[PDB]
Design a protein around this ligand. Structure first.
Ligand SMILES: OC[C@H]1O[C@@H](S[C@@H]2O[C@H](CO)[C@@H](O)[C@H](O)[C@H]2O)[C@H](O)[C@@H](n2cc(-c3ccccc3)nn2)[C@H]1O
Ligand SMILES: [Cl-]
Length: 138
């Protein structure tokens, strides 16, 4: 088991062909989860499942620059379930982060922060039991 919030160092930043894998279980009465790919205090890619935003389940993605959030990206598919185990895979591609949950493609997020080799940490927070977090090159 890992302690949440968890920091996964990404030595030398991210690069295309780098695959991040996160395994955990959603807590039974979960409200929120976040992955934060960070460049110092900036958040290059925030991936934020919300289980109860006005009685709707939605994933919000965004970037934080100089402490300001930008334009949110929202789509409707919500593959997480309270109480159940999940796998998140984040593949860095040249133009975007590509995210799959439980082996099904979910969304892509275009790179707004373009100094990929300075995105040197991943924070994992919110209403999960975190089993493992790691990376490999494909
Ligand atoms: O844009 C992404 C951010 O949105 C805000 S909320 C936002 O606020 C605007 C101004 O009022 C409204 O215009 C808009 O409609 C509404 O969506 C949210 O607080 C931010 N946030 C989430 C977390 C967090 C922490 C721990 C675990 C999980 C998540 N930390 N910061 C982060 O998601
Ligand atoms: Cl939230």
């Amino acid at each position: 088991p890992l302690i949440v919030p968890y920091n996964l160092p990404l030595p030398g930043g991210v690069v295309p062909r780098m695959l991040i894998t996160i395994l955990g279980t959603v807590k039974p009465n979960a409200n929120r989860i976040a992955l934060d790919f960070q460049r110092g205090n900036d958040v290059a890619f925030h991936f934020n499942p919300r289980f109860n935003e006005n009685n709707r389940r939605v994933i919000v993605c965004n970037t934080k620059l100089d402490n300001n959030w930008g334009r949110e990206e929202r789509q409707s598919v919500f593959p997480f379930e309270s109480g159940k185990p999940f796998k998140i895979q984040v593949l860095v591609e040249p133009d975007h982060f590509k995210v799959a949950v439980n082996d099904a493609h979910l969304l892509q997020y275009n790179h707004r922060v373009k100094k990929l080799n300075e995105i040197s940490k991943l924070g994992i927070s919110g209403d999960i039991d975190l089993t493992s977090a790691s990376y490999t090159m494909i």
